[PDB]
Amino acid sequence: MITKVTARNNKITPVELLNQKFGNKINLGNFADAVFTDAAFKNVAGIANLPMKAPVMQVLMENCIVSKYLKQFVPDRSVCFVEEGQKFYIVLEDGQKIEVPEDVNKALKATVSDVKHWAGYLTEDGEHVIDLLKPAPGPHFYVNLLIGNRLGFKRTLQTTPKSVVDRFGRGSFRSHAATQVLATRFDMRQEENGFPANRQFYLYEDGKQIFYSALIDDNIVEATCKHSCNRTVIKYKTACNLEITRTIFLVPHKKGFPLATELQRIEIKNASDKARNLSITYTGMFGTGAVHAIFEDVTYTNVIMQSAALYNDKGEFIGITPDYYPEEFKQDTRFVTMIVRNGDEKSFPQSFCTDYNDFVGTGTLEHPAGGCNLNNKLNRKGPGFFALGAPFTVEPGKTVIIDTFTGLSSSKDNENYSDAVMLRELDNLLRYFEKSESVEETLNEIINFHENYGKYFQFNTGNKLFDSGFNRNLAFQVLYQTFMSRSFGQTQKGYREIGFREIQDLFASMYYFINIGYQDFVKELLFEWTANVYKMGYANHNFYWVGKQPGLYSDDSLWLLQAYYRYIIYTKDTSVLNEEVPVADGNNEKRAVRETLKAIIQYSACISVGDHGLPLLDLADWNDCLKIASNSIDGATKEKLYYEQLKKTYGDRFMSDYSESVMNAFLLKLAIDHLAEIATLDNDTQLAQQMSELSKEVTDRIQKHAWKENFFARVLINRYKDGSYTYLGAKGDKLSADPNIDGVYFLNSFAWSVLSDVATDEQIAIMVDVIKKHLLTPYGLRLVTPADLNKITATGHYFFGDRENGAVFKHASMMAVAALIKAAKKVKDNELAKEMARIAYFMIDLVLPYKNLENPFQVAGNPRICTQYINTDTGENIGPLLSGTATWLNLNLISLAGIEYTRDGISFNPILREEETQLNFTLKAPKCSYKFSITKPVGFARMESSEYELFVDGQKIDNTVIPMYTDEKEHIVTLKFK
Amino acid sequence: MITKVTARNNKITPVELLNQKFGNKINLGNFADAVFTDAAFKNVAGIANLPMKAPVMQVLMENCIVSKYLKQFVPDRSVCFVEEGQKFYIVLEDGQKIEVPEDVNKALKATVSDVKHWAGYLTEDGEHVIDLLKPAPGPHFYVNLLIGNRLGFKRTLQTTPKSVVDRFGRGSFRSHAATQVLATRFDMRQEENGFPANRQFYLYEDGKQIFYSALIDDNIVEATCKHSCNRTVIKYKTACNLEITRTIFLVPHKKGFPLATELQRIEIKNASDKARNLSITYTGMFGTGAVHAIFEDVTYTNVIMQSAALYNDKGEFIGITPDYYPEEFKQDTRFVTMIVRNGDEKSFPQSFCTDYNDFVGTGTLEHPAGGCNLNNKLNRKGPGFFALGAPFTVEPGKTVIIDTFTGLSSSKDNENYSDAVMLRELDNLLRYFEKSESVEETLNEIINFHENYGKYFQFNTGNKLFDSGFNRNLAFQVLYQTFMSRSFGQTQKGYREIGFREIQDLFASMYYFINIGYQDFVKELLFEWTANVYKMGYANHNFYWVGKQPGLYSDDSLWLLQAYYRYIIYTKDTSVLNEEVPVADGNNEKRAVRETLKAIIQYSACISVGDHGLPLLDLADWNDCLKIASNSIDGATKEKLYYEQLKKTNGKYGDRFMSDYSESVMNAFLLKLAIDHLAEIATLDNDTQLAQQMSELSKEVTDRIQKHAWKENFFARVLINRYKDGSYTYLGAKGDKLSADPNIDGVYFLNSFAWSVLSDVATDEQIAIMVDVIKKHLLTPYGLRLVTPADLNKIANDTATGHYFFGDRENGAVFKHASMMAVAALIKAAKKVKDNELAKEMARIAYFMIDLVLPYKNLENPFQVAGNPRICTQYINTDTGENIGPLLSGTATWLNLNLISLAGIEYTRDGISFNPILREEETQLNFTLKAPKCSYKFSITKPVGFARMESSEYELFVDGQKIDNTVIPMYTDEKEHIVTLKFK
Ligand SMILES: [Cl-]
Ligand SMILES: [Cl-]
Ligand SMILES: [Cl-]
Ligand SMILES: [Cl-]
Ligand SMILES: [Cl-]
Ligand SMILES: [Cl-]
């Protein structure tokens, strides 16, 4: 009787209906916008010929003049606005073209003025300038990510502060782990990361509110946000002629500082001919220490704390701290302080509120009723809401500066901890920043540290958006992910530990740290990860202060050999192999890095193998949503069963019918090759020979049992005596959920068969054909083809296009691009190479953040930060902002530029775009420098198949391995393809 | 170097500083208010002579005129406003008394106008009338609780809908368990139970916003909320002369209805001389099915759903449902519909929005930029925000009615479930409510069901606030807690299962249900609880669809005998004992109720006992924050160890389970009572052998307690057996050596006293002694606290620290539930003890404690005491006197029992044992009492002073026959019986 129509099942869209109605009467262009005028969807109001997709109608319908005019026609008639000439006209299905009245025309003209830049634009330095009134392409588009700096201090990974900042400065701020300084919000909308008050302030004049930092009213004439590397600057101009600048950054750690401090500087310039007496109220919400109790017992979170006030030596109020009763929430101590700088004079706040209800009173957060006159009452309960007040006079043409310091001290950086330690550290912070210029100097330390950091690799091309995008923005993101893994962002808000696997981030950032003198830090990290390997060779799946989930996932330890291979090959520092690092098993057991690397290979090569001598899948490997195994087991559980098996009968096979992971075999084969080269370089001929032979034995196992006519299988299945299911991931697996596709195909089977150097040239060609047929979509390379794994009872969680139901997972797509690039350099068939390169560049174009500003309202994403996946139904780039995408994009762009590090130096083999005639970049090495220049005619060119000349400091060279020089001089490398 | 000053400090308060400065210069009256004018606390601005405590200064400082005036004096100098005549003056420390300017005087006069009623007031019917501008005494004060009605349908406990509504209609709404219909919010503030948009709407005129249901602006002239039993009515009058009425209630279940529906009716009357063309936009946020993912993965919650639109037979849009991909979130289906009634004609909404960002756009939720012209775009993603729009014209003097229906259908009430079932059920709902008067009729069904429900017991005294407070409000709360246990309220928002123990609620509500013909329902509940007892006699600690945590807590099964004793004694229905109910062990095993009650007693009396033959404490008993035991065990774990012990011993089932585990004295009292109960039941069932057996076992247990648990001062709480040392022997009396207060020898638990008397173990000499101890150490100016300070770290495995500041919860609060159990004991003793002076004193303490718990009294001094004037709260902070939530606790249940006990009603085998204990100042008490097959009118008169039947001269008559013993039979002649008691 009643009918249901879903958003996806709805037939025509508004724009398609507009075309059906007006397509043969006016030129609609190729972009238009429209909305249905009624709940039944029979008519549309639209606007024609836009320069790109944009929600123009929704911005128009905010205008009162325009909605009144349309009301004469809508909802009972369809309509389209057209600028046919330079006046606007309204057009009806009945042919009429009516000139709209002058005020409607003024408003339409103004609305459609700057549509090309509604999502903002990028400066030449890669910074995102955003208008605060314009709509958002999506919830991650207008977001920036900040990070502190604890390099050279205790426990860098675990103690580096981090925050998220949107275009109005909203969001939140953390110290160690998921410790909240400013309150995170866990609610319905992705846009709401923080409690709304966080970082916001009000200005008053004569008892009247005239400004709120997060409300654009008629008093605001200009309002812009600029997101840069590790700071955000938000600028306003009011009609009363004030110029307000908010600058937000995290303080780099110094001796004696709190573990975490966020600095917001507020500059207020009076651009008028008269002095003005104003007051500022600065607001925010401290995070609770009892995060779980937010869901389970909110009253608890409130009663366990009370507000407290801070006073200096002269009895002057300076700030607020939330005081906790339970000892478990007393190991961190939060604070907020404000300094008002009026020329010479510095002063502190004169009033405060610590109760949200008294502050808002009868009004709202945008217009609080108790916001000017603060009651100075310390709240006996939480939550830790604060409001700090101060009056001040700004003389004509002059500026007053308000510096706020918000932060946390912690036992994690201090022995014998109490709140006394916070008080000392806060004093150190405030003394260090007594001078006004002290803040500008630190901001410039930050800017310069990051500019310096990126100089490991600089592109210098005819495209400043790409250059700045890689040279600054991507460099920063790969730094960020080295410290933060996947643990914090706009929509990453829950507690996450560091994934053993996510040592991948170090694959890219390594070279950056080494080249600004932090080689010991990279060493530190290798060792921290190495301490999470058990004697038997498996790894803790996660660790933070301490490791957990021992050998839960089969792949983890294998990643470590790539990290070490990368470090040792680059620095030649073999001494790392003799280091005695704790084993994850505990006691006080230590083991030489060398013997650990041998144990990891032995676990996957000899012990935890299946019927075909390939590594066991266990619960799962890299692919987390591939859960099959009938009664998988831990590494600890396996260890105990392994030793009983040995009694009932070290290094022999653990017997079982468990499935085998082909991906792991590829990781293993690569790991072994890596160890061989390492041994050779370490002058250990026996280990090098042993591993070299083991590499051949594993290659033959894969080639014989995993190549399935079409593709490398993903999983080998051994538990059906039946022979009913034998493998998954190639033709004849009998597991497809698409009738048009025989078999299931995983992108990583291809990617790792090439990255491990197992696939022959004929097999690569074959797999590339399959990929073009079935994994390549108009939005890139999807992870897997549709599968029916129920045959070995879980249903899907996602509509088509999202995540595991057919998305382009950009991290996996970049691992596949790495394989394509590697193959394009080596395969004999130049035509195959050309095509693999085309695919690589096609996929890179879909991932480069800056390109999200071409068609931002369809593609969304974030123009400075890589996002996780592309919805294959809409093309939208979907968060989170932290993923393996940035790491592998970085590696890939450097690979395309031709840089690969080997034992004898740099193997130089660039693959440029067909249309490029020139590529230039600079490269730092620890004890030298390089300038590279590559020229070629239009068309596909590579060293394996084109004529070329290579010069190093003007001397023609036949050897394409360029040595790592140590003379501290800049070396000119020139490559001319004929 | 830097100094820290917490909110808890010994510094002078603002009011005390005001007194120090102005006390000898102006009359400050009895009450004043003040605030510090600066962050250093050196000066105050205040106002003198208020009729009660109130945040008058804070309300004044909202006024722009007044804060400007004060700025001439503050912050550098102190000040006090004083009214002299009809003019206001400002007074300085330097004596000057300055007349304030006329606009400041206008504003001060208006502010201080109605200060006595700033927290609202109660109608004679016990309804709370609240002004929407005035401040809140606390986060639970302005809150109402609503409930559906699934009586006579499947699984009543688990399927009854419930919602919470504050004075602006904010909050949320649930179906089964913690299934959200409208979205709950889990954030920093206790005031924020729901997503802000829930239940709110906007009115437009000529494309201009003129009204928002949750914003009081200059256009609003009056704005009032009325909270009644199971509905809330919110009224507004605008300056443009509209009268808006919002009525909110939950729909009682009917055949074919959705499992949960909330109805909000919006009436808009044009009180002007011209027609007006308006439109309404009705908003809200559907709850997600993926609650955990709100913390763990918010993007997930968004992508797993999309919006969908609903259309009737004529292709007319009627509403929105959120459509889910994953099967796990497709077993419930939510909807929202709106009907606009303009006289005879009904119409449906003409537009919608399902995207919060498009709706708010450039503005805010209070003033949305996209709120008038809705884009009609179905959102491909969540969250399930909705906005429904409709234009309408209201003629002069006429009213239009907008009915909204929000709800959920579920597989939990339907086999072979799909969203098609929702569509059918929604159609049944909309057909049933086609006629305008259909809504008023259902509201009246609700009003009348509750008025009828309360007629089990009606007080008719010279105090309407007390009468309505007990007769309607408390009746309702005890109903609510029978269905909801402790699972939902303003600040109870997480998932909670039903505690075996919380069958206590049925102790009070039982009689109410029976007396409106729902005796089977009470029977159903007894049986549902009985199915969670295992063969061996222990119980699942929690159950919802299914039971869990088998014999985790030692007390649970013991409560069941009180429920049955209460049912059987009242109805005489012994047939319940032959009923075959499933055992919690599963298979298809059933057992007779009779043998289960025997198994419970055997478990605690014979099997799970310690060295002194008293029941084991195990992990814990009633007191959850009493965790000690070195390596406690489950009942299932115990069972398995018990059967191997019997093998390695040649034992007989029923022998003792051997261990050094501690014993619970509270459980011994529960046991002793349980056994007495079983004896009386057997006697009534004509089972003379069981009755004799239990009577003897009651004596044997009484001697064990009396010999091993009485410790010169008090009954111990716990007996400790694991120290060969003899280093610690007991906890809960003098010489236990476990006090954390140097001034107190020993630790004293309120429940040791309470249950020693409720079980009838304590002698008269022991009661006198314990009452002395209680007056010394447990009685505070804010009532009876649960326990005295203890140092349990000496005997626990842990090294636990406290979580609470002094006064809150386990650090010294008055837990009102425990205080009401102690008052029950005081009342029982006051009736029986030989010493009349002791009785008099116990009765004073009882009434003193009841006065601190009666909700209506929270409106005397509301801004210190807070609470809620219609609903009992959980505890009183012993530092401030504030009544703190949640709104659901054992307090209401035991308050109900206690007030009925004081009125003199106790049910026994021979009928009603009538022994009233009136207040000293009362000269008269009247009430009516329903019984299943008769009725009673009671009248009691006495002179001023303490009076009781054990020690005063009196006459007692029944219709006109003198009674000499206290017993009034339960008549069955369907007539009203007049009972008169005259104390001389
Ligand atoms: Cl994969
Ligand atoms: Cl994110
Ligand atoms: Cl990822
Ligand atoms: Cl207790
Ligand atoms: Cl509550
Ligand atoms: Cl309780």
Author numbering:
A (entry chain B): 1 to 649, 653 to 795, 799 to 984
B (entry chain A): 1 to 984
Wording from the paper:
The crystal structure of CDP from Ruminiclostridium thermocellum reported herein is the first solved for cellodextrin phosphorylase enzymes. In contrast to the typical glycosyl hydrolase mechanism, only a single carboxylate side-chain (Asp624) is required, which acts as the general acid. The active site of CDP lies at one end of the (α/α)6-barrel of the catalytic domain and the substrate binding site is largely delineated by the loops that connect the outer ring of α-helices to the inner ring.
The structure of the CDP was solved to 2.3 Å resolution, revealing two copies of the protein subunit per asymmetric unit forming a clear dimer. Uniquely, CDP has a further ∼120 amino acids at the N-terminus, beginning with an extended arm that leads into a globular domain comprised of a central, five-stranded, mixed β-sheet, flanked by short α-helices; the latter is unrelated to any structurally characterised domain. Both the α/β domain and the N-terminal arm interact with the β-sandwich domain of the opposing subunit. Indeed, a β-strand (β1) within the arm contributes to the one of the sheets within the β-sandwich (dashed red-circle, and C). In the homodimer, it is closely associated with the β-sandwich domain of the neighbouring subunit; indeed, together with the N-terminal arm, it appears almost to embrace it. This interaction could have the effect of drawing together the lower portions of the subunits, whilst causing the upper portions to move apart, thereby leading to a widening of the canyon that lies adjacent to the active site and allowing larger acceptors to bind. Firstly, the catalytic loops differ in length, being twelve residues longer in CDP. Whilst the loops are structurally similar up to and including the portion containing Asp624, they adopt completely different conformations after Ile628. In the case of one subunit of apo-CDP, the loop continues away from the active site forming a helix (α17) that projects from the protein surface, before returning to the protein core; in the other subunit, a short section following α17 is disordered. There are no large conformational changes between the apo and ligand bound CDP structures (rms deviation of 0.692 Å for a dimer on dimer superposition), although a number of side-chains become reoriented to engage with the substrates.
